Every structure is written in structure tokens, then in C-alpha cells.
């Protein structure tokens, strides 16, 4: 009936992950994968008596890969949103997040609200083809949106004065502000709300299983332990 | 597979509503529909890229209209109950409510408990064919139950002395006690428990979508904003 | 479509229960069944206009009986675990529990953690073929595990010095420590986490109904009332 | 030692109240006092075996009357603030409130934040000599502040176009928006935070008593009962 | 300045206790004292580098002994009430309780509310000179109140048919219903609210210390540990 | 009467701080003070219309300086403990913390509990004369305690193999594990409980004021804002 049965029979759990989003999912020096969600993936696979098989995907290709049935579950710092919910399921959430500006610490007071940010003289930098760009284009009608394809240098462009800010996952803003003390994550009284969860096929029994596993992890304190370790 | 796909393809969301229950659902002077649940309906339709098409229904006809597939979702100050759950699904809840007496303020102390209310000398007035009548007949074995078909004058009958009280949705009792300072909503330490939710077909993917949409509204604070506006 | 419809048509709800686990499920002097979960079962059956038909099962046979479709729901102090979730569904939970040591009160400080317990000189007694034995074998690599088939005398073996402790449901440890003031339930800052819930077939509509019924019981305070009565 | 002893000996509790703030404190047709805080005052006096003696005061005179020892406690919809805390004590709080704009419903979107409100072309109306005026002058450096002494007509000035909005207690904004459907209370995701509490002398034992009384009212559900009745 | 300093200098903490209220305070076979509050007392004394000296008191004499300064703190299953708050302080609370009927299990449905209980044909038994008698006389204007001085046999009188019920601390009702399976503690949706706390002199610094000690016990989980052990 | 009045009259608030505990209190390149608690200190002083005057103190001298009345309040990442509560007051708490091991990440599993840590072959390093040393000596009867006076190099000694771990404030362990990815903060399901608060004189009115100020900061979200900025 269900993918749950298929996974139990094959002894393989195919987990898609991007490897481009520390602390959730990133590449080891040896070319392997590591991170909070890789850790969780190992635990889910083990609960199913299954080998963990990591399937590479990317943000632009995530939903195409989903439709093509390239994986059983995607675990990679993925936000729940209604566009994705059109085609897929999500597990129960494991983290509260949301987009938020990262900007020069010296300019923090200037960029608290969309109204302050959405001005002709402002430049918001974004990476191409993902939810960051969608969020910028949906919420900025006046500010310049600068699309920057090289994610290795994107935050550096803010420091270098090519852009005023980027609006990205709060967890990313926070981490980058550590990598670049020059930068600060804006933190109003919240800027946007979202949750992280695991992307699932439209499969009732498999979702019930994944949710039960994640719920036990959450209530037992295991989830918090791993979050304290990684995040 | 799912009604979710059908709605996404047709670009129409059919929402049933009664238009007889301010603040959830009522008629504008022009003959249109307005209210908290009409507002929410517009937001759900928009999230689906769909036109909102309001389908009239009524309390006596609600479940018949459901069975006849006259709508995709019903949004109209509808309480979750197990009788309806026999045939339909409900979304996650958006409001805690429950039946409660509305009575003369001067008589408030007399009507705190079913035991006090369920006495030969008491008259409880009710509207025909809905959950109010069912609740009265299930909980009053001694008191007189007076069925009154004209909802425009029903609360006036309490003030006029034709009945001692009515047991109805707390939100309605509260509102009517504003319309008629003569009346008070009874508020024990609670009288009955119920939640309001949206009536759904037995459709897993569509329910998951609606719940995700409503959950985001709830956690982001949007739901509270609209409740503060309307309720 | 659903077992929900079948139950509504037949007017019978088949509930499996073990009758070997006071306060959830036990036998009356007359050979009937009683307990918290029998009480709840009566309420669920009544909500469905159905006769309650109790179907005997046992811990070793529970999942076999499930696979054989011997019952509609099992209600018997059953813990949610992922092994069972492989084949079945669970309702939303009604009690937080988890395994915990029961030991001589005089030895309580010695048996707070698995590390203290899992030592060559320690003997943990367990009943055969259930989750207690599985838990012991999964968590004790050094201590002796003593399998004792006679559940009537099993706790007596601790008092009699044949074993140091047993690790069992906290609710059971607590109750037995009342039956035997000689014994104490260990209570660290928690030892293991689990929830009790009702075992369901993979049936979406029936699960939605059961969950709605149980949710109303929980939020209305009925669940707490019955727990205060029995537990 | 304490005013507590003095009140217990004299059998009189002097409670100051303004009588100008329904639902907390207002005047009856006969010239008496009524309201939520008068109700609570009666209960506190009764707990002390004391007569309730209401002592009139006003917002401009409140702290002067306090310094002059004209009362034992003031109960009148009073917000805790640090200016008052310089000289007085407060009981534990009984209501969460805070200032918020009340404006034309048609203009609600324009007045969500101080930044939007504090513009040259905007006029904020306020009553003289209280916390409303202090709040306006502390938070508006550009907008016009219009001082209006006649509290009976002050909200009417907004409707009449003499002012764009007033920033006042949320409970007042809410109530006035009921009196004038023309007006709406602004409700962002919160605009300002404050609590209502009772004004006390610097008297440890008397504060401990009042807090114990109020805590019992809160935890027993009595407080909520009276709030549901009045507010 | 404070009793805190005096206790620190003398190295003695005088704790009053009744020894007539298991599980809080009772007598050992050897004539010593034991119980949850004796345990807590030892911990408070130790934190102060002080010897624990237990001072006997009784319910009728508690406040007289307080006034006579016979002890530093009383720890004995004592409820906070406003009568005691007239003269003494209380620590922050450590347990939520309240009076509740204990009655024959077969009669449980008959005695849910004061209204049902307060009838001419009903007899409520009470022990003399304490809060139980005060509660009965304050809340029963019709029922017979039977004063029974022998606390060893008082619950037996209910079983023996000399009385219908007693209204006493919920923790006591619960325990007695264990001692006498014949009896049940009534548990409405709550009957009365009260908290247990420690009785303190009007001494600010000593109260701040005791509260800090108890707060740490509560937040660290120590309090729950001891409650799980004793209660 | 109170120091509150004295501060209001003098227009000076003397705040003691150590300047040796980033992120709470540290020295700027210019020799000034900075940090979360310096930020909060500025806000408290401003609320009192007072100049902030920072008074240097140190961990060994803190309580001596308190007794000598060298300051009005101490704000410096100070934990509430009962030893300090003997002489001083604390404000309400602003942060939950507690001691926890920091150790090599590779050795994390070995040092989860005091029992594992307190072994002959283990060396715990500590700084002299503070709560870290007191905690080590109170909880380690077998492990070696190595006292290391140079706080600049103390964590380096763990990395260098001179010690296995240090037990220190969780916030410090966390920060140092960032400074030294080589190290990890242990995070069991909690190791020890403590709160941070501000050290106050035994002065009722001043404590009530400080608590009111801090409570407003907490409930308004200001406290969280500053914590998100600094911590
Ligand atoms: Cl770690
Ligand atoms: Cl509005
Ligand atoms: Cl019972
Ligand atoms: Cl009312
Ligand atoms: Cl125990
Ligand atoms: Cl920041
Ligand atoms: Ni770790
Ligand atoms: Ni609005
Ligand atoms: Ni019962
Ligand atoms: Ni009322
Ligand atoms: Ni114990
Ligand atoms: Ni910041």
C-alpha cells in the first residue's frame, strides 16, 4: 500500500539533501554529507532498519526531483510553505524560523520593517531561483533587488557595500553574523514566520510513521539535544 | 487524486456559508457576504490561486449539501461535533467556544448549571433544526423547550418573558448581550466545550493543505489579527 | 470506504483488550472487563451508536491479532512505539508514561541511571515476550536478565531477593509500590519517554473520528475526570 | 506596624477611584460608583471585615492624593508605570493592556506603527495631564498633538475630522470602537505594553495581603469570572 | 535586622509541625517526625548551616503559637488563606490543593456541587476547630454538620453511615480513598482552590531567602522529585 | 527611607560590574565597559533619571564590596545562589543557566554525569576563588581539581591536555566552544540549575522598582531583543 512498506522491505531509505546549508546539511572535506538533518536522517533510517542513502538535490531542482520520485524524504533545512504543500506533504515541524534581514550592525535600526527596507535607495541582495528571491520580489516593490549567483561571496557583497542587506532564513542570518561580526541579524519584537520540516510524498502511512518518530524525538528531549549540539 | 489538484486546475474554490451568523458569516446590504470566515475564505482561495465562489447553504441543509458535493469547504462559524465527523472531516480548530445560557442579567445566578436550568418551571427557547435544539433536547428532561422559528425575534422573546433563557454558542450569547444590555451570557468557572473549524470532504491532501494554511495563519499571528478585527 | 462507515452500519465496535493491566484493563470477579480503557471504550462505542464488543487479546498476540483483523481498535494501556507504527496507526496520546525501575526503597539511590543498573552484579527481572523484555535486552549488556513467566509473583521476586529491580511502565511501577510499600518507583529529574494511545488500523477516516472524540474528551476535561477516577 | 493592622482595627478600607473610566470605574445615575474595580474593591474590603469607603480622586491628582495619604489603595483602571513606582507600590497585575491607536476604520492600515503616525500631516488628539498626553509627547516628534479637555466629545473629534487618531488604553480603544462603529482599535502583531494593577503605599505587609487576595482570585477563576462579566 | 541573621548566627532553625497529617507531617514509631515537609525542612535548615529543631504545634494552636514566636517557620501541609495572612506571611506555594468532598463511591454523582450537598437530608462530618469546620459552616446552611473529635475514626463514620461525606483537603481525600476503597474523592471539572505553603513571620529578608530556596527546589526539579517520592 | 529615594535625589546609579565576562560585562579597547548587563544598566539608570556610574568589582571581592556599600546594584552575569542570598537580595531573574562541563568534543559522551566525571583518572580545571571552584569541590570527591589562575589560558589547558574538562556557566561553555571548535558544551536531557539576576541591597522599595523595570523589559519583549543582540 504505502512507501512505508516498500522501505521496510528494501531496507533502504533515500533521503534528499542539498549539502549547501550548514548547520542542516553540508559537505565534509572527503565529499560526504554532514549536519543536523543528516544526523536526524541516520536516526530515521535506523528506526526503519534501513540503510541511509543520501540523494543529492538542489534548491532549484527540489520539487522537480520530488515529482520524479528521486527520494523518499528530503531533509535539508527545508521550510514549510504553501507552494510546496500544493504537491507534497510535510512532517510535523522541528524548528521555528522565518526570513529576516541581515545587515551592517551600524545600520540595524534602519532596516527593522519592510516599509523602511522597501525604498528606492535601498539594495537587497539575493541568491537566484529560491525562496529568498521569491520573498524579496513579493515584498519589495521599490528597493533594488540584486541577484548574486555566487553563494560563497554573497554576504561579502553586503560588507563590501554592493548591497544594504539580504533577507534570508534567521538561522542563516544568525550564523553569517558570527562569520562576519561586521553583520547583524535583525530581530524585531518577528519579521516573517516559517517552520522547518521534512518534505514527504503524499503518503499517509509514511507520514504517520515519520511524524511519530519525530514526535518521540521532540518529547523525549532527543531533538533538543541534537539542536543544542548542531545549531 | 485529490480535490486539491482539482481546485488548483480549475482555479475555483467553492466555499459554503450560511450568511446568518455575524460575526462569522452575514449578508451585506447589497446582498453579498461578509464576516470573519468570508475574510478567511478569501485568503485560502488566494493561497490556491483560485477565485472565491460562495455557495449558499443553511444549518438544516449543511450536511445534505455536503453529501451532494455542493462545495469544497464550508466556512461559517461551524462547530466540530462527532455527528458531523461521521461523514465529514474538519480542519484544525480556529476558535474555542461551546454552548452557554443567555438570560436576563437579573436572573444570572439562577441559571449557572444544567441542574438549575432543567426544572419544570423553566422555559428554554431554541431555534429549529440545528445544534441548539439538539443540545436542549439532550440536556433538558424537565424544562420546557420552546421552538421559535423567527431568528430575528428569538432573543426578544427572552426579554419579553416568553422564555427564561436560550442556550447557544458563547460567541452568540456574548454578542446578543451587547445588542440587548438587558441580557447576560452566563460564564461559570465552562458550561460546554466546542471548537469552531472548517468542514472538509474526506480528502487527505486537501485537509493537509488547509491545515497547513490555517496553522501558518495561527502561528504567524494573522489569525489573531483577524479575530481581533471581527470578533 | 472506511471502517468508520462499516462500524456505523453494523452498530458494533470491536475493542481488543488484555485484561491483565489494572488500572487500564482488568477482569471483574464475574469474568467481565473493567478499567480506565474499558470505560473510555464504552464512551467511544456510544458516540458511534454502537455496541461495545470486547475482544480478548494478549501482549504476545497483539500485533498478530491486529494483522488478522480481529478488532477495530485496541484499548489496553498500550504504548506507542515505532515497531508497532510499522504496521498500525495510533490515536493521539492520552497519557505520558515511559519505563522506569522499580526496586527496593532502600536501594533507590543505586538504580537511577542505566549505567548504574547495567552492571555484572545486577539482576533485572522481566516478563516474557513483551516490551519490558525488549527494553531490558536493548539497554542491558552487562546485568543479568531474569525472565519470569508468572506475572502474579514477578514483583514478589524483587522483594524476595531473586532480582534487584524491574524496569516497567511508570504507572505500573507506581501502583506496585503501593501494593508493596517495600518497593519504590525510581523517579530521576525522566528515565525513558513513551505515551499511551489506542491502536488503530491504517484507516484515515476512522483515525480522524477517534482522534476527534479523544480530543473533545481531553479539552472538555472528561479525560482528566476519568483519569482522576481510575489512575 | 503596618496599614494592614490599622485597616483590620478600624474596619474601614479607603479605596480611591476616578469614576471616569468605564468598565473599571464609573458613576451610577444616583451618583454612586460602579465597575469592575469597584466590584473587586468590595471583595477586598469584605475579606478584611472592613467597610468599603470610596474616596474620589482624578488622574491629574492621583499621585498628589497618594502622597497626602488620602486612601489605602487606588483601584481604577490604573496602569503600572515606572514614574508611579518611584513613590508607590503596585499589586500584582490583573490585566495586560497598553496604549494603541484608535482611528477611522477606513484609515486603519495607515496607522500601524509610530513611524507611520509620527508625520507632519498627522494630528493626534489627547486628553490633558495624564499618561495619554505623556505617551504622545514622548513618541511623537513630528505629528501635531491636539489637547482636548472635554472627554465627553474627545472621540467625536476623530470622527469629525479634527484629528486622525488618539493613542489610548487598548481597553478604551476597543470600547470606543463599539460606541462608534466608525472607529477601529489598531491591533498590530503589539503597539505598547502595560499592565493594570492596584496602587499601594510602600507597605510590605499590606502589599503581601493584597497580592495574596488577588492571587487567589486569579487562580480560583474568580478574577476571570468578573472580567468576563464587566470587560 | 532580620530573623535570617539570627538563624545564621544561632545555627538553629525552629520548624513547627503538627505530625498529624501524612504525607506532609507525621510521627514515626519511635516518636520522631517524618513526611514531605519534614524532608523539605531538613533541606532548608541545611542550606542555612543550621540544626533542624522541630517544634510541635497543632491546628487549633497554630496561630497562637505563631503570635508567641514559638517557631521560625511552620511546615506541615498548611494552606494559604487570608485569615492567616492577616498576621503572618506565606512562602511561595509548593502545591495546588483545595477542599473537596470524600464520599461513598456509590454516591459520588450525588455530591458534585455545594448545591447538591447543602440539603436538609445530608450530613457532613468534620473535625473540630480547623479550616475544615470553617469551610463547612461557611458553605452549608441546610445540611447537618456533625463535629467528630476523634480523627482516627472520622472517615470510618462515613463508611458506617453516620455521615454522607466530609469536605477536606483533596490530598487527604485522595489518600483516605486509598485507605478505604469504599470511599471516593469527588473530582468535578474544581470544587475549591487553595495552595500549600510555609508559614513565615512578617520578615522580609527571611521570606526572600525561603522563597529563593524553594524556587530553586521547584525549578531544578528537586521539589517534584520529593513530591513524587512522598505524595 | 529607601535607596530608591537617595538615587532619585542624587541622580546617580552606582552599578558594580567585573568586566571579565563577555557577553555580560567586558572591557572596550579604550578601557570602558560593554556588554548585555552594561546595556541593561544604562536603561535602568535612564529610567531613574540618573547617571550610570560603573564601579569596578571582582568575583572574589563581590560580597565584600557589597557589605562595604560600594554600589547600589551589581550587574555582571551574576548567578543567584543561597550563599549570596544570606546577605543580599536578588532581582527577579533574567536568564536560566547553570554549570555544565566543557570538554573535548571527542570526549563528550564520557562526561555526561557527575558520576562519570568524578573518577580518580579525571582532571577538572577551575579558576580560583569563585563559584566554579566551589562547585567543583562540592561535587568532586575523586577527580583531581586543578586550580588555574590565568583565565586567559584556562580553556587552552583543556585543549592542551592538562585537564579533561571544566565545569562552568553554560553560557560560558557555549561561547568558549565557539572560540575553540575543539571544545563542546555538554548538554544532557540539565546538569545543574541556576538563574542570572542583579544583586541588590536589602531594600524593599528599591527591589520593587528594579523588579518592575525588569518585568516590563521582559514582558514587552525588550529583554529578549537585547538578549538576541548580545547572547
Ligand atoms: Cl555538543
Ligand atoms: Cl479593527
Ligand atoms: Cl472517584
Ligand atoms: Cl454577565
Ligand atoms: Cl520513591
Ligand atoms: Cl543584533
Ligand atoms: Ni554535543
Ligand atoms: Ni482591524
Ligand atoms: Ni470518581
Ligand atoms: Ni455575569
Ligand atoms: Ni523516591
Ligand atoms: Ni541587534
CSV table of C-alpha atoms in Angstrom, one decimal, chain D residues 11-216:
chain,number,residue,atom,x,y,z
D,11,UNK,CA,-12.8,48.2,59.9
D,12,UNK,CA,-12.6,50.7,57.1
D,13,UNK,CA,-10.8,50.3,53.7
D,14,UNK,CA,-10.4,53.6,51.9
D,15,UNK,CA,-10.3,53.0,48.1
D,16,UNK,CA,-9.6,55.8,45.7
D,17,UNK,CA,-11.2,55.7,42.3
D,18,UNK,CA,-11.8,58.2,39.5
D,19,UNK,CA,-15.3,57.2,38.3
D,20,UNK,CA,-14.4,58.4,34.8
D,21,UNK,CA,-13.3,55.1,33.2
D,22,UNK,CA,-16.0,52.5,32.4
D,23,UNK,CA,-15.7,49.5,32.6
D,24,UNK,CA,-13.3,49.8,35.6
D,25,UNK,CA,-14.8,52.8,37.5
D,26,UNK,CA,-17.8,54.9,36.6
D,27,UNK,CA,-20.7,56.8,38.2
D,28,UNK,CA,-24.2,55.4,38.6
D,29,UNK,CA,-27.2,57.6,37.8
D,30,UNK,CA,-27.7,58.1,41.5
D,31,UNK,CA,-24.2,59.4,41.9
D,32,UNK,CA,-22.6,56.2,43.3
D,33,UNK,CA,-19.7,54.3,41.8
D,34,UNK,CA,-19.7,51.1,39.8
D,35,UNK,CA,-17.4,49.0,37.6
D,36,UNK,CA,-15.0,46.1,37.6
D,37,UNK,CA,-12.6,47.7,40.1
D,38,UNK,CA,-15.4,48.8,42.4
D,39,UNK,CA,-16.6,45.2,42.4
D,40,UNK,CA,-13.1,43.9,43.2
D,41,UNK,CA,-12.8,46.7,45.9
D,42,UNK,CA,-16.0,45.4,47.6
D,43,UNK,CA,-14.4,41.9,47.7
D,44,UNK,CA,-11.1,43.1,49.1
D,45,UNK,CA,-12.9,45.1,51.8
D,46,UNK,CA,-15.1,42.2,52.7
D,47,UNK,CA,-12.0,39.9,53.0
D,48,UNK,CA,-10.7,42.3,55.6
D,49,UNK,CA,-14.0,42.6,57.5
D,50,UNK,CA,-14.0,46.2,56.5
D,51,UNK,CA,-16.4,48.7,55.1
D,52,UNK,CA,-15.6,49.9,51.6
D,53,UNK,CA,-15.2,53.7,51.6
D,54,UNK,CA,-14.8,55.1,48.2
D,55,UNK,CA,-12.5,58.2,48.0
D,56,UNK,CA,-12.8,60.3,44.9
D,57,UNK,CA,-9.6,61.1,43.0
D,58,UNK,CA,-8.6,62.1,39.5
D,59,UNK,CA,-5.9,61.4,37.0
D,60,UNK,CA,-4.1,64.7,37.5
D,61,UNK,CA,-4.4,64.4,41.3
D,62,UNK,CA,-3.8,60.7,41.8
D,63,UNK,CA,-0.2,60.9,42.9
D,64,UNK,CA,-0.7,64.1,45.0
D,65,UNK,CA,-3.6,62.3,46.8
D,66,UNK,CA,-1.3,59.3,47.3
D,67,UNK,CA,1.4,61.4,48.9
D,68,UNK,CA,-1.2,63.1,51.1
D,69,UNK,CA,-2.4,59.6,52.3
D,70,UNK,CA,-6.0,60.2,51.2
D,71,UNK,CA,-6.5,56.5,50.6
D,72,UNK,CA,-5.3,53.0,51.4
D,73,UNK,CA,-5.4,51.6,47.9
D,74,UNK,CA,-6.4,53.0,44.5
D,75,UNK,CA,-8.4,50.8,42.2
D,76,UNK,CA,-9.5,52.5,38.9
D,77,UNK,CA,-8.0,51.0,35.7
D,78,UNK,CA,-4.6,52.2,36.8
D,79,UNK,CA,-1.5,51.2,34.7
D,80,UNK,CA,1.7,50.2,36.3
D,81,UNK,CA,4.5,52.6,35.2
D,82,UNK,CA,7.9,53.4,36.5
D,83,UNK,CA,7.1,57.1,37.2
D,84,UNK,CA,4.5,56.0,39.7
D,85,UNK,CA,6.7,53.2,41.0
D,86,UNK,CA,9.1,55.9,42.1
D,87,UNK,CA,6.8,56.8,45.0
D,88,UNK,CA,4.2,54.0,45.3
D,89,UNK,CA,3.9,50.2,45.2
D,90,UNK,CA,1.7,48.2,42.8
D,91,UNK,CA,-0.2,45.0,43.5
D,92,UNK,CA,0.5,42.1,41.2
D,93,UNK,CA,-1.2,42.9,37.8
D,94,UNK,CA,-4.7,41.8,36.9
D,95,UNK,CA,-4.9,42.8,33.2
D,96,UNK,CA,-2.5,43.1,30.2
D,97,UNK,CA,-3.1,46.3,28.2
D,98,UNK,CA,-1.0,49.0,26.6
D,99,UNK,CA,-1.6,52.1,24.5
D,100,UNK,CA,-2.9,51.7,21.0
D,101,UNK,CA,-4.2,53.9,18.2
D,102,UNK,CA,-7.9,54.3,17.7
D,103,UNK,CA,-8.7,55.7,14.3
D,104,UNK,CA,-11.2,55.7,11.4
D,105,UNK,CA,-11.6,52.1,10.3
D,106,UNK,CA,-11.0,53.3,6.7
D,107,UNK,CA,-7.6,54.6,7.8
D,108,UNK,CA,-6.5,51.6,9.9
D,109,UNK,CA,-3.7,50.4,7.6
D,110,UNK,CA,-2.2,53.9,7.7
D,111,UNK,CA,-1.6,54.0,11.4
D,112,UNK,CA,0.1,50.7,12.4
D,113,UNK,CA,3.4,52.0,13.6
D,114,UNK,CA,4.8,55.0,15.4
D,115,UNK,CA,6.8,55.8,12.2
D,116,UNK,CA,3.6,56.0,10.1
D,117,UNK,CA,1.8,58.0,12.7
D,118,UNK,CA,4.6,60.5,13.5
D,119,UNK,CA,4.4,62.6,10.4
D,120,UNK,CA,3.8,66.4,9.9
D,121,UNK,CA,0.4,65.9,8.3
D,122,UNK,CA,-0.9,63.8,11.2
D,123,UNK,CA,-2.9,65.1,14.2
D,124,UNK,CA,-3.1,63.0,17.3
D,125,UNK,CA,-5.7,64.2,19.8
D,126,UNK,CA,-5.2,63.7,23.6
D,127,UNK,CA,-6.8,64.5,26.9
D,128,UNK,CA,-4.8,66.8,29.2
D,129,UNK,CA,-2.5,66.0,32.1
D,130,UNK,CA,-2.3,62.2,32.1
D,131,UNK,CA,-0.5,59.3,30.7
D,132,UNK,CA,-2.1,59.6,27.3
D,133,UNK,CA,-0.5,63.1,26.8
D,134,UNK,CA,2.8,61.9,28.2
D,135,UNK,CA,2.8,59.0,25.8
D,136,UNK,CA,2.0,61.2,22.8
D,137,UNK,CA,4.7,63.7,23.7
D,138,UNK,CA,7.3,61.0,24.3
D,139,UNK,CA,6.6,59.2,21.0
D,140,UNK,CA,5.6,62.0,18.5
D,141,UNK,CA,8.2,64.5,17.4
D,142,UNK,CA,6.6,65.4,14.1
D,143,UNK,CA,2.8,64.9,14.3
D,144,UNK,CA,0.6,67.5,15.7
D,145,UNK,CA,-0.6,66.9,19.2
D,146,UNK,CA,-4.1,68.4,19.9
D,147,UNK,CA,-5.0,68.7,23.5
D,148,UNK,CA,-8.8,68.4,24.1
D,149,UNK,CA,-10.1,68.9,27.6
D,150,UNK,CA,-13.7,67.7,27.1
D,151,UNK,CA,-13.5,63.9,27.5
D,152,UNK,CA,-17.2,63.6,26.5
D,153,UNK,CA,-16.5,64.8,23.0
D,154,UNK,CA,-12.9,63.7,22.5
D,155,UNK,CA,-13.5,60.6,20.4
D,156,UNK,CA,-16.1,62.5,18.4
D,157,UNK,CA,-13.3,64.9,17.2
D,158,UNK,CA,-11.7,61.9,15.4
D,159,UNK,CA,-15.0,61.1,13.6
D,160,UNK,CA,-15.5,64.8,12.9
D,161,UNK,CA,-12.0,65.1,11.2
D,162,UNK,CA,-10.4,67.4,13.8
D,163,UNK,CA,-7.8,64.6,14.4
D,164,UNK,CA,-6.6,61.4,12.7
D,165,UNK,CA,-6.3,59.2,15.8
D,166,UNK,CA,-5.9,59.0,19.5
D,167,UNK,CA,-3.5,56.7,21.3
D,168,UNK,CA,-5.1,55.4,24.5
D,169,UNK,CA,-5.5,52.3,26.6
D,170,UNK,CA,-6.4,49.3,24.3
D,171,UNK,CA,-9.4,48.5,26.5
D,172,UNK,CA,-10.7,52.1,26.0
D,173,UNK,CA,-9.9,52.0,22.2
D,174,UNK,CA,-11.8,48.7,22.0
D,175,UNK,CA,-14.9,50.1,23.9
D,176,UNK,CA,-15.0,53.4,22.0
D,177,UNK,CA,-14.9,51.5,18.7
D,178,UNK,CA,-18.0,49.8,19.9
D,179,UNK,CA,-19.6,53.1,20.8
D,180,UNK,CA,-18.5,54.4,17.4
D,181,UNK,CA,-18.5,51.7,14.8
D,182,UNK,CA,-17.0,54.5,12.7
D,183,UNK,CA,-13.8,53.9,14.7
D,184,UNK,CA,-11.3,50.9,15.0
D,185,UNK,CA,-8.7,49.9,17.5
D,186,UNK,CA,-5.4,49.2,15.8
D,187,UNK,CA,-4.1,45.8,16.5
D,188,UNK,CA,-0.6,45.0,15.1
D,189,UNK,CA,1.0,41.6,15.5
D,190,UNK,CA,1.5,44.8,20.0
D,191,UNK,CA,1.9,48.6,20.0
D,192,UNK,CA,2.9,49.2,23.6
D,193,UNK,CA,2.9,47.0,26.7
D,194,UNK,CA,1.4,47.8,30.1
D,195,UNK,CA,-0.4,46.1,32.9
D,196,UNK,CA,-3.3,47.3,35.1
D,197,UNK,CA,-2.8,46.9,38.9
D,198,UNK,CA,-3.8,48.5,42.2
D,199,UNK,CA,-1.8,51.4,43.6
D,200,UNK,CA,-0.4,50.7,47.1
D,201,UNK,CA,1.5,52.6,49.8
D,202,UNK,CA,5.1,51.5,50.5
D,203,UNK,CA,3.9,48.9,53.0
D,204,UNK,CA,5.2,45.4,52.8
D,205,UNK,CA,2.6,43.5,54.9
D,206,UNK,CA,-0.3,45.3,53.2
D,207,UNK,CA,1.1,44.5,49.8
D,208,UNK,CA,1.6,40.8,50.7
D,209,UNK,CA,-2.0,40.6,51.8
D,210,UNK,CA,-3.5,42.4,48.7
D,211,UNK,CA,-1.3,40.2,46.4
D,212,UNK,CA,-2.4,37.0,48.2
D,213,UNK,CA,-6.1,38.1,47.9
D,214,UNK,CA,-5.7,38.9,44.2
D,215,UNK,CA,-3.7,35.8,43.5
D,216,UNK,CA,-6.4,33.6,45.0
